Every structure is written in structure tokens, then in C-alpha cells.
RNA sequence: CAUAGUCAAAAGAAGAGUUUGAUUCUGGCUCAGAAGGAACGCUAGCUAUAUGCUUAACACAUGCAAGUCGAACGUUGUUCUAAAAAAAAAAAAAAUUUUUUUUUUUUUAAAAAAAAAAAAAAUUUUUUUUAAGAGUUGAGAACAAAGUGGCGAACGGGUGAGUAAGGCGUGGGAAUCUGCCGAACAGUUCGGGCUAAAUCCCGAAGAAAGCUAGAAAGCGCUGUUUGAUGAGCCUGCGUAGUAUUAGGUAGUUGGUUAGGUAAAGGCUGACCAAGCCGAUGAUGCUUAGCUGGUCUUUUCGGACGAUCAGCCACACCGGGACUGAGACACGGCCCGGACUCCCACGGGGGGCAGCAGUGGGGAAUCUUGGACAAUGGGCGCAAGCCUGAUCCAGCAAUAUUGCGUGAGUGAAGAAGGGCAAUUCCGCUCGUAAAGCUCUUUCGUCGAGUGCGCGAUCAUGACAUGACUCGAGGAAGAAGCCCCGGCUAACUCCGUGCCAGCAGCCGCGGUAAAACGGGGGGGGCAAGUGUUCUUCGGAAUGACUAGGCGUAAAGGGCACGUA
């Protein structure tokens, strides 16, 4: 996301000594066995890399889960306060409404009696 | 099997590659799960080649068992996401290379 | 060949302009960018303006 | 500090001619623009990248387009030979031997080292024949030679016939399965059968299957939990024309109960009810694959759905299932049909809408090419082997804001052509040409390096290319339409309502700027015209953005359903 995180926390690596490490044997059969062992070692290293990546993704998922839960509980707390404030305002407005409606009803009752 | 492989882009005699996460049965330039990056097989003005990868998505696909193809194994070793392929231990073929210098701007012998 | 490996996605960004880059030499080692390579990085970024002149 | 910072996401809005004696209005016709999978005429230098049977889903000669694995398994038959390690270079015709250390067995408790014929020596040696269903014959090479078995031939590739909603676009769901691939756990035991065997088939437990001390803790298989990827099933919304088609349905709509399916379900047997769909257009008829998108356009719309990619459907025409993780399967099987090729006449065989290619139809659409070097895919532990996927060459101005066909100078203003009271070198072709100087892009010719590059551990079809250097000589490279108005560009001769021209208005009946030729000129330019087709102009179906007194157009007038 930023230059500093990448520039500090990148594993820059040394030269790899595996490159050019083959020594030619005197028997083609032994050479084939040596190449087969090299393929098996490559499979083992790939499996270790897969396990490392599984653990990295799991830790990132756990962190995202706890962050989302924290935001959710903060949001719920804010909504629980907003709801109670609006309920109090609605209650005082409904209490103000009744006197006006009673007076208006009395006015209309007087008008109907006059017309009758 | 999910495969990290190379799709051909570019034009005729100007190859360019994209690094893809695909089902193996898919056509080479057809259906895919994800574009993971790119690779330029032609050398540029800086004297080297270019490559971009989505490192976290490549880690995701390798963690769930995707299998890289033969050039993608080399490209992922070169970026540090995979171990070196078994054949890089053999070393390079030698021989007398023509080391006579050519001018960078004009291509003629200095 | 040396390569120049860019990190793509939102988690590989060096900032507004692209992703972070390293070199990865043919011997198996990787290194940060040179000054010439830094100029190459700077000249290929997209510019957030119309073409003046 | 900094590989920081910068906040861009459009442009696109034109009018003209033609109804009248003239006018304004209404209203059509036509024109200037952009474009195409185009076709045809005339004319053509080059490179590159795209595109190239739109018609007959017409019929197809020929070659190729799917195999691979001996590390699953026997089988027969080919060859050749009768213990391991190390050294042999120097004095008095030469491949195979001598020396040193380990090791199996035999012979007389330490040492020594199959039968028959012919010959030699005192039991051994030399040569030859048969050895080897044989008191374990010791190594080796191919076995492809033919098979059984696994995996893949459900991918990739082609076409758009059908399909108007069982499809597609978009968003969801529950009642399912999922080979190979990643990650845990448990097992991998014993009999029989296919002439011989098995990782083939059957049986028992609990499901199975073994190979490799050549691949011995490496593969493989089975069961159970999972991730990942696919697949099946369902569904909301959106998605033609036609009412000069008004009713349609009878497993139809629902219920119950059995069956079937991996899985919900009238999916279907039986029984029961009479429902369900329809004027918010069912059903009938016609047309059509859908989408991303392509062309056009001041936004909207219209036309199209060809290349490419996603989804679907189909594979000579109909009908089926089998095997399989997956098919009701383009290059698999069975059946029926039409057509066709062999037949020894009993009977067999085939399916280019894979890549090339051929007939045919058509105005019209390409090579019977090269390589698996790259990328992708199948099989294999690999080595590899396949791959008309692809990559790359070939043909075609079919397309593309590309490049070139020279740059200067030159007055005998040459010759020649055209016009001319026949004005100013009489005017013009015309500085035009020729000549002279310079530069050689593109193309041509001759060479040279190649881990230049595509590809790297290695492997290069392209490549007779490219690159670099050299030779040469303006040399090899300009047309097509038009010139009465719309519309930029005018004279002479011929013709005489003829021959002809024409997008529209109109020209031609003896001085035609309109027909045809000469001369000159204008626009585009390796193109340029003509035809077809789409949008624009067209506010000419008007949402944006029009109307209905007298021009097309208020229903004769109400009442009322949606
Ligand atoms: K789709
Ligand atoms: K059919
Ligand atoms: K290949
Ligand atoms: K033409
Ligand atoms: K010339
Ligand atoms: K009413
Ligand atoms: Mg009139
Ligand atoms: Mg076609
Ligand atoms: Mg087989
Ligand atoms: Mg098949
Ligand atoms: Mg198929
Ligand atoms: Mg195609
Ligand atoms: Mg199509
Ligand atoms: Mg209808
Ligand atoms: Mg059709
Ligand atoms: Mg459509
Ligand atoms: Mg046919
Ligand atoms: Mg199969
Ligand atoms: Mg089955
Ligand atoms: Mg076929
Ligand atoms: Mg063909
Ligand atoms: Mg014809
Ligand atoms: Mg491959
Ligand atoms: Mg494999
Ligand atoms: Mg081919
Ligand atoms: Mg051009
Ligand atoms: Mg040249
Ligand atoms: Mg040459
Ligand atoms: Mg090379
Ligand atoms: Mg060529
Ligand atoms: Mg004019
Ligand atoms: Mg005349
Ligand atoms: Mg004219
Ligand atoms: Mg004329
Ligand atoms: Mg309109
Ligand atoms: Mg308009
Ligand atoms: Mg309106
Ligand atoms: Mg009007
Ligand atoms: Mg009105
Ligand atoms: Mg009236
Ligand atoms: Mg009337």
C-alpha cells in the first residue's frame, strides 16, 4: 500500500547456490537417480511453501474477522444510542400532539353543534 | 486441476504473456479464473525483462493446490514465491561467445 | 537476463502510480532498484492530467 | 523523505437542389459524411498487422487432425556370452594378457583350483556336435512382434441447422455429485477364473491392488473427514414480429401413495379433485442462436451478432443406450432410413459443419505448406512420444492516421501539342522535359557474424528473414474520377431530339462549357470510380424532439371494464 512497508519488509535474498550445483557422475544410471532425487527434493520444498502460505492466509483471515467484529459492535452501539434519542424525541412530540388534537376536536364539535 | 500458466497476448512476432489461474481443460486464451500478472519475454531498453505478479493471489492459489506450468515455475522461482526448478542445477552450456562490443545507439561495431 | 518484478494488487502498491519493484538478478539474488531503474519507474507511471503542450 | 506527492477519463450538434408567374407553409425525392467479411472496372512500388464460402447444415477423391505407458501383466522368439575393485609407460605383428586385494564353490586342515568324437600327455588340455522341462545357466540387448490392463480419446477443433424460453444476460437457492490436484487420518488380508499372468474379473471379511531393495519407504489403491475446481438441478428479474391468430391444455393443474434419480420435481404408475394458462396477449403463424460487442450517431437510437472470447445447440437424417468422475459421445457402439464404394456376389464399408484440398452453387472468399523452437493440452517417474491446438510461412489493395516513386538547378522559354482582333517571349502545356550537381529510404545484387532476440539447464520452425557492411544508379515504382447548377475546375473540333448522357434538376432539333474526341484544368491518390448494404443529414415515427380548424390526421356521440 505504501513504499516504506515494502522497502523494509521485503526478503531480498542472497545468491542461490543450488544453481550450477550439479556434478557430473561417471555412471548414467547414477545420474538418472540423482536427477530423480532432485525432483523429489523439489516436491518437498514446494509442499513446505504451500504450508507456509496456508498459515499466512489463515492469520490474515483471523485478523480481518476480528476487525470486522469490532467495527460491527461499535456500529451497533452507535445505533442503539441513536434509536433511544429518536424514541425520546418521538415521545415528547406525541405528548405535545394530544393537547392540540383535543382543542381542535372541541372546535369541530362546536361547529357541528352550531350547524345542527 | 487449477493451473498457473501463460496465456499468449501481443501480436504476430511480438509475443506478450499473461499469468493466469485456469482450469486445465480450458482453451489457452479462453476461459480463466483469474489474471495474476504479466510477463514480457522481449528484452527492453534497460537490458532486462519485465514481470508483474499479484503476490497474495499467487500465494492463495498455491496454498489450495494449484500446479504451475513449466515457464511459470521458472517465473515464480525468479520472483521468490517458489523454490528453484530441478534443472537449474545443471549450469549453463559454455563456448566462445562473441564479446566484440556494439554501440548501444547504432548497433554497429565500436 | 535480469528481470524487474512488480507487485500488483492493492497490497503491492508503492503509492499512487503503480506497484513496488525489485530486480531479481540471474544468480538467484534480488536487490532494490538503481537510479537508472528508478528513472524507468518514474517515467512509466500514469499522469493524472491532460496533455499540456 | 522519495520506487513519495500531482485526481485525467473524452470528442462528437453544418447544409444544398427540386412543386409556383412569384411567395410562405406543409410534405416527400435527391445530394455532400462515415463505414463493410463486400463485388466489378481501370490502374498498381513496398513493409507490417489484421481479415478472407455471407450462397448449398450441398456432395465429397487423397493425406493428415489422439494417443501414450514395459516403472500394471504374462506370453513367443531373436541376438550374444560360459565373480567385484586397482595398476601395467623402460633394456640385455600385437588384442588381450600379467600383477595386487576381496568373494562363491569344489578338491586333497592347511594348501590347491552334461554327454560324445579326434589327438596329446600323466586325471588334464586343444578343436568340434548336441546342450540346457533343465541336481537354480551365468549377464546382456532389444522384445512391438502381437496382445491383456490403466489413463486420455466428454478436452482441444468445427459449424449456427434447430431453438421465441427447458436458451441467453444478470442476481440468487437447495434437494446433489465431483477423475486428476492440495492437506489430515486409518488400512492395503486371504481364496478362485480368463490356455499364461496381472494394478483384469468373481468371492470372503470392512473396502482394496499391487509394483519397486532395478522406482524399498518411493509410487499406487481403498475407506473416512476436508479445501479447490468443475457438473447436474431450481428460481426472481430482463430479453422478437404478428389480433386480417381469441381461446389453449387433458399428465393437463393440484393432492395422496408407490416407483425411479446422485439429487427437488407429473419425472411416472395407480387413485382422488377440477383445476392450470390467457386481452398485462395464452395458443397459432413467421423469423431468429444469445451475450461481450461491430458500424453509425451530440448523448438517445438504428442496423448487425462476421473475426475473437463467454454460454447454448448440432455432428449424413431419425431412434437408443453402454462404458465412464464426466457422454446419451464430430474422427465410439447398436438399430432404422436415404445416398454411395467395393464384392470372389455370400456379404461387407463409409459420413470434412477438424486442417489442407476437389466438384457444385454463386457477383464473390486462400496452400492438398513448415515445426512441435514457444505457449497450451494427453500419456509417462523420467527419457520422451503425440498434438492441422497453436506458432510460423504461402495466396488476395480485402482493411489499416504507414512509407516510397527523388532533393536541387535548369531558357536553346528547345522540339512537338493546343488556342489565338490572331494583343504582352501572341497565350498556354512549361522549369515542364532534356541537360547538370547531390542522396540512395523502399525494392535489387554480393557478403559477414551470430548464448542479436523470441529460450533457456538445453532445445529456433520462422531464417533464402532480420541486423551489420559493401556494389550500383534517378535509376525499378502514377493513376482514377471529374470540370451546366447542386460542386472545386473551360476552350476547340465532330454530331445535329440522332448518336448518346443522367444522383437530382435536366442536356442534344447547326455556333452543345451537359453527348464523343483533342488541348487545358480541379479533387483525391497506390488508389480511384461504379453497384449493393447500414447509419447520418431526416425533428422524414419526434424520449431527447413533431403534429391533427382550412395541408395526412378528432372516433357520429356517450356510458363504462382494465
Ligand atoms: K456465460
Ligand atoms: K440431429
Ligand atoms: K509443443
Ligand atoms: K478497387
Ligand atoms: K526514377
Ligand atoms: K366515467
Ligand atoms: Mg405544383
Ligand atoms: Mg465461416
Ligand atoms: Mg492402450
Ligand atoms: Mg470421440
Ligand atoms: Mg467435443
Ligand atoms: Mg476459429
Ligand atoms: Mg457465432
Ligand atoms: Mg402472440
Ligand atoms: Mg437459423
Ligand atoms: Mg439479437
Ligand atoms: Mg454434409
Ligand atoms: Mg475415461
Ligand atoms: Mg455407469
Ligand atoms: Mg470427420
Ligand atoms: Mg475444410
Ligand atoms: Mg460458378
Ligand atoms: Mg508442453
Ligand atoms: Mg505428470
Ligand atoms: Mg498446421
Ligand atoms: Mg495509406
Ligand atoms: Mg535498403
Ligand atoms: Mg540480400
Ligand atoms: Mg537464441
Ligand atoms: Mg518473409
Ligand atoms: Mg464552380
Ligand atoms: Mg458545335
Ligand atoms: Mg457535368
Ligand atoms: Mg464533354
Ligand atoms: Mg431520427
Ligand atoms: Mg439528429
Ligand atoms: Mg414528443
Ligand atoms: Mg410535422
Ligand atoms: Mg390536440
Ligand atoms: Mg366531434
Ligand atoms: Mg372525420
mmCIF file of N, CA, C and O (backbone and C1' of nucleotides) in Angstrom, chain D residues 168-188:
data_model
loop_
_atom_site.group_PDB
_atom_site.id
_atom_site.type_symbol
_atom_site.label_atom_id
_atom_site.label_comp_id
_atom_site.label_asym_id
_atom_site.label_seq_id
_atom_site.Cartn_x
_atom_site.Cartn_y
_atom_site.Cartn_z
ATOM 1 P P C D 168 -28.107 -21.167 -21.357
ATOM 2 O "O5'" C D 168 -27.939 -19.671 -21.846
ATOM 3 C "C5'" C D 168 -27.224 -19.336 -23.025
ATOM 4 C "C4'" C D 168 -27.437 -17.884 -23.343
ATOM 5 C "C3'" C D 168 -27.080 -16.931 -22.217
ATOM 6 O "O3'" C D 168 -25.701 -16.610 -22.182
ATOM 7 C "C1'" C D 168 -29.231 -16.402 -23.051
ATOM 8 P P G D 169 -24.979 -16.272 -20.792
ATOM 9 O "O5'" G D 169 -25.482 -14.814 -20.417
ATOM 10 C "C5'" G D 169 -25.153 -13.673 -21.196
ATOM 11 C "C4'" G D 169 -25.805 -12.433 -20.636
ATOM 12 C "C3'" G D 169 -25.639 -12.211 -19.141
ATOM 13 O "O3'" G D 169 -24.406 -11.612 -18.806
ATOM 14 C "C1'" G D 169 -27.898 -11.912 -19.723
ATOM 15 P P U D 170 -23.623 -12.062 -17.489
ATOM 16 O "O5'" U D 170 -24.515 -11.519 -16.288
ATOM 17 C "C5'" U D 170 -24.683 -10.129 -16.060
ATOM 18 C "C4'" U D 170 -25.804 -9.836 -15.093
ATOM 19 C "C3'" U D 170 -25.727 -10.515 -13.738
ATOM 20 O "O3'" U D 170 -24.814 -9.920 -12.839
ATOM 21 C "C1'" U D 170 -27.907 -10.744 -14.583
ATOM 22 P P G D 171 -23.965 -10.848 -11.846
ATOM 23 O "O5'" G D 171 -24.980 -11.188 -10.674
ATOM 24 C "C5'" G D 171 -25.596 -10.146 -9.940
ATOM 25 C "C4'" G D 171 -26.831 -10.595 -9.192
ATOM 26 C "C3'" G D 171 -26.680 -11.722 -8.194
ATOM 27 O "O3'" G D 171 -26.049 -11.308 -6.995
ATOM 28 C "C1'" G D 171 -28.691 -11.981 -9.404
ATOM 29 P P G D 172 -25.478 -12.375 -5.944
ATOM 30 O "O5'" G D 172 -26.770 -12.882 -5.169
ATOM 31 C "C5'" G D 172 -26.915 -14.241 -4.799
ATOM 32 C "C4'" G D 172 -28.366 -14.636 -4.696
ATOM 33 C "C3'" G D 172 -28.623 -16.022 -4.131
ATOM 34 O "O3'" G D 172 -28.604 -16.065 -2.718
ATOM 35 C "C1'" G D 172 -29.837 -15.774 -6.124
ATOM 36 P P G D 173 -27.827 -17.245 -1.966
ATOM 37 O "O5'" G D 173 -28.800 -18.501 -2.090
ATOM 38 C "C5'" G D 173 -30.137 -18.439 -1.622
ATOM 39 C "C4'" G D 173 -30.971 -19.584 -2.142
ATOM 40 C "C3'" G D 173 -30.574 -20.970 -1.671
ATOM 41 O "O3'" G D 173 -31.096 -21.251 -0.389
ATOM 42 C "C1'" G D 173 -31.039 -21.001 -3.994
ATOM 43 P P A D 174 -30.327 -22.243 0.602
ATOM 44 O "O5'" A D 174 -30.916 -23.667 0.235
ATOM 45 C "C5'" A D 174 -32.319 -23.881 0.148
ATOM 46 C "C4'" A D 174 -32.650 -25.155 -0.586
ATOM 47 C "C3'" A D 174 -32.152 -26.432 0.077
ATOM 48 O "O3'" A D 174 -33.091 -27.464 -0.183
ATOM 49 C "C1'" A D 174 -31.222 -26.263 -2.081
ATOM 50 P P A D 175 -33.518 -28.476 0.978
ATOM 51 O "O5'" A D 175 -33.856 -29.809 0.185
ATOM 52 C "C5'" A D 175 -33.514 -31.081 0.711
ATOM 53 C "C4'" A D 175 -33.004 -32.006 -0.364
ATOM 54 C "C3'" A D 175 -31.493 -32.027 -0.554
ATOM 55 O "O3'" A D 175 -31.125 -33.348 -0.937
ATOM 56 C "C1'" A D 175 -32.518 -31.398 -2.573
ATOM 57 P P U D 176 -29.717 -33.969 -0.494
ATOM 58 O "O5'" U D 176 -28.736 -33.492 -1.646
ATOM 59 C "C5'" U D 176 -27.493 -34.125 -1.857
ATOM 60 C "C4'" U D 176 -27.292 -34.460 -3.308
ATOM 61 C "C3'" U D 176 -25.869 -34.777 -3.704
ATOM 62 O "O3'" U D 176 -25.487 -36.088 -3.351
ATOM 63 C "C1'" U D 176 -26.807 -33.309 -5.291
ATOM 64 P P C D 177 -24.086 -36.337 -2.620
ATOM 65 O "O5'" C D 177 -23.069 -36.533 -3.823
ATOM 66 C "C5'" C D 177 -23.261 -37.594 -4.739
ATOM 67 C "C4'" C D 177 -22.770 -37.254 -6.121
ATOM 68 C "C3'" C D 177 -21.281 -37.043 -6.276
ATOM 69 O "O3'" C D 177 -20.537 -38.243 -6.272
ATOM 70 C "C1'" C D 177 -22.424 -35.367 -7.462
ATOM 71 P P U D 178 -19.109 -38.289 -5.549
ATOM 72 O "O5'" U D 178 -18.176 -37.394 -6.470
ATOM 73 C "C5'" U D 178 -17.872 -37.768 -7.802
ATOM 74 C "C4'" U D 178 -17.245 -36.628 -8.557
ATOM 75 C "C3'" U D 178 -15.905 -36.156 -8.037
ATOM 76 O "O3'" U D 178 -14.836 -36.978 -8.449
ATOM 77 C "C1'" U D 178 -17.274 -34.286 -8.448
ATOM 78 P P G D 179 -13.598 -37.214 -7.469
ATOM 79 O "O5'" G D 179 -12.489 -37.869 -8.393
ATOM 80 C "C5'" G D 179 -12.627 -39.183 -8.904
ATOM 81 C "C4'" G D 179 -11.776 -39.370 -10.128
ATOM 82 C "C3'" G D 179 -10.367 -38.812 -10.037
ATOM 83 O "O3'" G D 179 -9.468 -39.691 -9.389
ATOM 84 C "C1'" G D 179 -11.362 -38.138 -12.069
ATOM 85 P P C D 180 -8.402 -39.126 -8.336
ATOM 86 O "O5'" C D 180 -7.460 -38.192 -9.206
ATOM 87 C "C5'" C D 180 -6.577 -38.734 -10.171
ATOM 88 C "C4'" C D 180 -6.058 -37.653 -11.079
ATOM 89 C "C3'" C D 180 -5.284 -36.537 -10.401
ATOM 90 O "O3'" C D 180 -3.929 -36.874 -10.161
ATOM 91 C "C1'" C D 180 -6.865 -35.614 -11.901
ATOM 92 P P C D 181 -3.265 -36.623 -8.724
ATOM 93 O "O5'" C D 181 -3.432 -35.068 -8.473
ATOM 94 C "C5'" C D 181 -2.639 -34.109 -9.155
ATOM 95 C "C4'" C D 181 -2.916 -32.728 -8.631
ATOM 96 C "C3'" C D 181 -2.827 -32.572 -7.128
ATOM 97 O "O3'" C D 181 -1.496 -32.473 -6.671
ATOM 98 C "C1'" C D 181 -4.781 -31.518 -7.897
ATOM 99 P P G D 182 -1.033 -33.265 -5.359
ATOM 100 O "O5'" G D 182 -1.343 -32.246 -4.184
ATOM 101 C "C5'" G D 182 -0.938 -30.893 -4.272
ATOM 102 C "C4'" G D 182 -1.563 -30.060 -3.191
ATOM 103 C "C3'" G D 182 -1.508 -30.635 -1.794
ATOM 104 O "O3'" G D 182 -0.250 -30.476 -1.177
ATOM 105 C "C1'" G D 182 -3.656 -29.753 -2.208
ATOM 106 P P A D 183 0.319 -31.634 -0.233
ATOM 107 O "O5'" A D 183 -0.671 -31.636 1.014
ATOM 108 C "C5'" A D 183 -0.633 -30.576 1.952
ATOM 109 C "C4'" A D 183 -1.739 -30.634 2.975
ATOM 110 C "C3'" A D 183 -1.807 -31.858 3.867
ATOM 111 O "O3'" A D 183 -0.833 -31.848 4.894
ATOM 112 C "C1'" A D 183 -3.983 -31.250 3.169
ATOM 113 P P A D 184 -0.018 -33.178 5.290
ATOM 114 O "O5'" A D 184 -0.846 -33.803 6.494
ATOM 115 C "C5'" A D 184 -1.971 -34.630 6.252
ATOM 116 C "C4'" A D 184 -2.981 -34.511 7.361
ATOM 117 C "C3'" A D 184 -3.110 -35.743 8.237
ATOM 118 O "O3'" A D 184 -2.122 -35.757 9.251
ATOM 119 C "C1'" A D 184 -5.264 -34.957 7.613
ATOM 120 P P C D 185 -1.349 -37.110 9.623
ATOM 121 O "O5'" C D 185 -2.347 -37.824 10.629
ATOM 122 C "C5'" C D 185 -2.712 -39.176 10.444
ATOM 123 C "C4'" C D 185 -4.164 -39.407 10.758
ATOM 124 C "C3'" C D 185 -4.586 -40.863 10.751
ATOM 125 O "O3'" C D 185 -4.311 -41.497 11.983
ATOM 126 C "C1'" C D 185 -6.101 -39.607 9.444
ATOM 127 P P A D 186 -3.260 -42.704 12.057
ATOM 128 O "O5'" A D 186 -4.195 -43.983 12.202
ATOM 129 C "C5'" A D 186 -4.037 -45.102 11.349
ATOM 130 C "C4'" A D 186 -5.369 -45.671 10.943
ATOM 131 C "C3'" A D 186 -5.299 -46.910 10.068
ATOM 132 O "O3'" A D 186 -5.178 -48.093 10.832
ATOM 133 C "C1'" A D 186 -6.745 -45.337 9.073
ATOM 134 P P G D 187 -3.800 -48.911 10.852
ATOM 135 O "O5'" G D 187 -4.192 -50.303 10.194
ATOM 136 C "C5'" G D 187 -3.722 -50.643 8.901
ATOM 137 C "C4'" G D 187 -4.853 -50.964 7.961
ATOM 138 C "C3'" G D 187 -4.432 -51.686 6.695
ATOM 139 O "O3'" G D 187 -4.359 -53.084 6.891
ATOM 140 C "C1'" G D 187 -5.819 -49.848 6.134
ATOM 141 P P U D 188 -2.974 -53.864 6.704
ATOM 142 O "O5'" U D 188 -2.946 -54.222 5.157
ATOM 143 C "C5'" U D 188 -4.126 -54.653 4.494
ATOM 144 C "C4'" U D 188 -4.103 -54.272 3.042
ATOM 145 C "C3'" U D 188 -2.793 -54.540 2.326
ATOM 146 O "O3'" U D 188 -2.720 -55.873 1.865
ATOM 147 C "C1'" U D 188 -3.570 -52.356 1.812
#
